[PDB]
Paper text:
The type I-D operon contains the type I signature gene cas3 split into its two domains; the helicase domain (Cas3′) encoded from a stand-alone gene, and the HD nuclease domain (Cas3″), which is fused to the large subunit as part of the core effector complex. The Cas10d subunit is bigger than other type I large subunits (Cas8) and similar to type III large subunits, yet retains the type I functionality of discerning PAMs in target DNA sequences.
To investigate ssRNA binding and single-stranded vs double-stranded target discrimination by type I-D Cascade, we bound type I-D to a ssRNA target containing a protospacer that matched the crRNA spacer and performed cryo-electron microscopy. Our efforts resulted in a structure of the ssRNA-bound complex at 3.1 Å resolution. Overall, the structure is strikingly similar to the double-stranded target-bound complex. However, in the single-stranded target-bound complex, we lose recognizable density for the PAM recognition domain, likely due to the flexibility of this subunit in the presence of a single-stranded nucleic acid. We propose that the lack of a distinct dsDNA PAM in the ssRNA allows the PAM recognition domain to remain unlocked and inactive (PRD disengaged). Our structural studies revealed a flexible PRD in the ssRNA-bound complex, which suggests that the type I-D Cascade does not require PRD engagement with a specific protospacer flanking sequence for ssRNA binding. Indeed, binding of a ssRNA substrate containing either a 5′-AAC-3′ PFS (corresponding to the complement of the GTT PAM) or a scrambled PFS (5′-ACG-3′) showed nearly identical binding with an apparent affinity of 11.0 ± 0.9 nM. We observed no binding to a non-specific control ssRNA that lacked complementarity to the crRNA. Single-stranded target-bound Cascade has a flexible PRD (PRD disengaged).
Numbering used by the authors:
A (entry chain E): 111 to 220
B (entry chain C), C (entry chain B), D (entry chain D): 1 to 320
E (entry chain J), F (entry chain K): 1 to 146
The structure:
Amino acid sequence: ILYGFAIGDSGSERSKVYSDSAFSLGAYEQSHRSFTFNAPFEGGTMSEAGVMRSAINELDHILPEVTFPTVESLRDATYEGFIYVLGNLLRTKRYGAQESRTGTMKNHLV
Amino acid sequence: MLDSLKSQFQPSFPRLASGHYVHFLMLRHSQSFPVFQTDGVLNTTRTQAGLLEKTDQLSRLVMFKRKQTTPERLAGRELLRNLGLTSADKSAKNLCEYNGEGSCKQCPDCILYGFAIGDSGSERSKVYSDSAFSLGAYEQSHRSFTFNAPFEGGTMSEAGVMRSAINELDHILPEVTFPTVESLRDATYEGFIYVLGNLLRTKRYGAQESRTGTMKNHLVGIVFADGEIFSNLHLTQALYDQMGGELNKPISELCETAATVAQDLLNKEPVRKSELIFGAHLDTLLQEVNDIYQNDAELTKLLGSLYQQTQDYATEFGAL
Amino acid sequence: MLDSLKSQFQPSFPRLASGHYVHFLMLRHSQSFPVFQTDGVLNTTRTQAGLLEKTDQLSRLVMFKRKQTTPERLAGRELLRNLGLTSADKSAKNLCEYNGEGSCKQCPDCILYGFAIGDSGSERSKVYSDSAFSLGAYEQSHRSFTFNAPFEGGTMSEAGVMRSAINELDHILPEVTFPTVESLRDATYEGFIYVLGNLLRTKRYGAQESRTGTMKNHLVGIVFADGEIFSNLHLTQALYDQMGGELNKPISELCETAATVAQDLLNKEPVRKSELIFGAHLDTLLQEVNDIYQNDAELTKLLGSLYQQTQDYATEFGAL
Amino acid sequence: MLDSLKSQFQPSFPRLASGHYVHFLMLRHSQSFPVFQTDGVLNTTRTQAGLLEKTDQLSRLVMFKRKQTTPERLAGRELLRNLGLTSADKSAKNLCEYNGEGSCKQCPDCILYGFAIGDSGSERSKVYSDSAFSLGAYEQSHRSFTFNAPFEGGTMSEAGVMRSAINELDHILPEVTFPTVESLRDATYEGFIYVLGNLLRTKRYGAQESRTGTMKNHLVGIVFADGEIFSNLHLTQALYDQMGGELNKPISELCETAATVAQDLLNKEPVRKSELIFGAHLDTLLQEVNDIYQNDAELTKLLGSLYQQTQDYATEFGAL
Amino acid sequence: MTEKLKLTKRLVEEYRRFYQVELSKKPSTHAILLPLSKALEQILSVPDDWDEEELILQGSGQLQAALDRQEVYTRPIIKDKSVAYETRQLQELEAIQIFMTTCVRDLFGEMCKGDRAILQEQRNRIKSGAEFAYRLLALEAQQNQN
Amino acid sequence: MTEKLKLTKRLVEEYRRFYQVELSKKPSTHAILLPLSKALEQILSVPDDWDEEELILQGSGQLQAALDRQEVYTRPIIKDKSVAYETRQLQELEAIQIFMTTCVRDLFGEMCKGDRAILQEQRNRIKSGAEFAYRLLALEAQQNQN
RNA sequence: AGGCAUUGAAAGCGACCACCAGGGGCACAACAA
């Protein structure tokens, strides 16, 4: 009822919670690096049983201390709906791809 | 420029027309998605592609007959109301109901574009007009757009059930050109500035005027003449043949091609022509007609005179 | 060309006919949605499709009996008023009221196209005309369009009360052709130039001239003869047979075919044919006639001369 | 500023209009990746890049007709419901279904933006838009993004089968500019503050409002006139022309170029122009309208009045 | 030959041969005419310069890759446990190719004259007749089985 | 037939000459389309600010590198004949290069107008055509004797 | 600094809606001489 749904014969309901895309305050060249990652055979080397299995590539990751200013909004709520939505903003921390390894953030409400 | 042309017009409206036609030759360019329809589809018709060389059959859109006079009238009537010459209030002595029994019988719209219902009789339009055809073929000149209408909840199923608010409609693309020749039979100089006013000042055409169908009317010539010149379809076909069918060209080049075909077509008409206003003489004419319509004292002097001329016609020859 | 044709004609109008027919063979092409009606529907009739081969019945549109002579007649009267040979103001010695007493009984319209109202007798039209038929069937040759008339506030309700103004009308499509012979008996050479002028200088035909019904008259032959050639239905059925009904051909190929079927038919008519103007001799003669109708001095001289001839006729044999 | 403009407007809505247009001329800058789609692809059309120079073809995105009126319109209805002037509950006497038989006939939305189905007739909009075009080429104003919708387990499998919720969608980029004119016919001063309020106060456009389509409407001018000015396409072509085909320049510079182009174009339109609000007069006018919408007492007084003005229109001229 | 008219019952029975839903489930119009909606969408969506024989393999692949996005309850060929799965697939892919060629030649090519504008104006009408024809055929099966 | 039937056929017969999963394994869409997916991905992943002939030579090496990760039973041009390494490797390279000539100079360059925008909105449909055409060919090649 | 190794499987949408009301003649002329 707050964030919405659409598949089914029962209906659909639009989100009461509104977002934009957020943008980095600093420029791209000052706020990223690309990092090599490799995946050896667990015998500890890239030789799988005499010949190399290829599993090395690089991926581009944002640095820490990079700020995305954002304004979320909630419409036609109840007080307990606000306590849920402000709660989710305060309580969640894992944003990006590879949650299991990265993309912890801190949302400062200003 | 206009100081010369006052000599060619009638000094007041005549009982019957004596062959003093002014023709307005123009290109109506689409600006944004007009809908020219009857019976729920875009009106389109099969035609020869062009007069002599391109002789294949070709479906083209039709701006059917009234859809390019009605915007002219309704923009003119609104100006008669701004200037206070006519009025909308059902108590007033100078009331004009459009297209109804309570129509005026003596204002400039009524004498120049005509009326028919009620005891006082009818008057045929001094403005003569025709259906206009898309210069290009229908298949490259239209697109179909779907539309829906959700409940204000931002859904198609606020009631728990779907709205049935979804269907599609066909719209004419931008940069599509409809060549047209409007005509004015036995007007005064002030009537000429009123009718030329509408052609230059009206902007909206077809269905959904409040959302769509802005157009850019480029007047390419004015021709003073002893009779009626070519049909819209003949100008459309002559211009397609002149363009060799490669219609993907700038609007300004299409307008000089339109001027230079139109003069060659005028050379083949059994009509005496007194003033063929084209090119640099038309630019200075239209810049002089603009500085009437931009000036409060000049426009109110001129159209008030039309009112009296048209009132006089009504009380001497017309509906009384 | 016209300098040789001058011989064929008589020097002044005679009181009784003397043979001397000139037959104007035409194809009339629609250009913009004509309405040819009586009694609220397009006039249509069942006929055999073509003379010898395609002998099945077929319904074709009828451009009925007056619809192809009043446009001609009224366009010529407008010219007589532009040239100043007649006037439309009451208290003028050269008045000609159309369809009343106070018709002039001396002008070229009164003599060539006839009169019959009031005292001082009646005059048979020297222009002989006929109902023309569409070369194609009614089903391939018309469409129904809907017409609305909303209130000027832009909608079909004026106080929440609806407006009862939606009907539909049937209109003949563009590029549909109506074969014709119109015929002139006992004309002088200037009388021939006047009648031919009307055929080339007219452009509108049906109901709602103010908005619709532009047509393109291609004169395909002029034939000098002692009396009437084949019927209008007969030229149509001959032309349909010559194509086998494959009628979707460009208008030039259709006019060039009509010239050849017309010459085939003329060779089966019991009529001495003095002169047969077709093809390169006709598109020279049409050019020599365009040169008259584009020149004020030639045209005022030529129709002024007719005026005298028709006025002479009036005082010697007619109503004076 | 507004204390002077109260004189330009009507004292109550008129039966038929009178040529008292006010035009709002604005640049709509994209933020947060908008979607303007109809058949599952972003809407684009081929157009001429400029007017005099830069005649070459350019495909540009189109914010198709309704997608710029209905975001404005719905933000107005919400304010009417915050102030309690209209209601959403089915037991209330001032209920207003948005789209349905169930509509109000009397609120500011219904009389300004119009209504259509019902027994009580219909009402044409007094606020007029048309489709608005990207100043830049489509190739340099869009990007397609993949989206997926996995299971909460953080995977595309729930039973070891794949869920198949993958697709890509075409998005308009930020800092893409659509030049626009909305125009208003015969409104009152309070109706002007309602629709201008909507232009300024509504931020989200097109599809997927809850996640994208926030826009910066920079109002560039407000022009009071005797008729309608240039199209959206003509303003985009003129502004690309003046910007030299190098649109990749600051947002404030693009706004000042638009103020300069708008005034250059206005001088070529055959309309009287009573008031032209540009530069410092617009920045001051906007600030005191921004003050009206920030003070609860003034906004409740002004919009309460508009309600009455529209209930009076409805009971005197509308659906009763 | 006659195929310029009278298409609609064969068009629906040719997809009813590989996709179904029972009216006892009280289904949506969207669940009844699902195969024809994918076929008409593919014909109208892909560029208008492509001609018939490339559309059939694309439109069939759009429909095989969309019925495998649904429950075997809806597939009265893949649901026949009496047959080995590769021979269910040989029947499935020949049913889809035979339906979808009737949608690209008989429907679009012949009945709509190969014109996307003619097809587009009358799409909703074509679809409606297939929904009713599906119900009409569903009401035949309960007659022949009783 | 030629102007798109041969294009839409040869688009898969030119990868069947160098890449084949045998269908009885019931393989994935992702496993069948492995050449076309990496060809269309390589074409979209760079702008047209450098030429189609640079795109073939960089792309053909990338596709030959991805098939150096495939198991040899998937490469019929090495599996299905017994001939010297340098000659079976040369025919495998010319089958990979010629497949990349059609894929750039006909599929992208003519059929997709030479334009990345009309290709990108079309990938799912040209993939579903190529998916369907591969099974339509492979199961015909297997089963036409039955 | 060396050899090596620049990825890999899968997924490619899913549901629903394809319109809604209301208008469908209005005025007069039926002979003129």
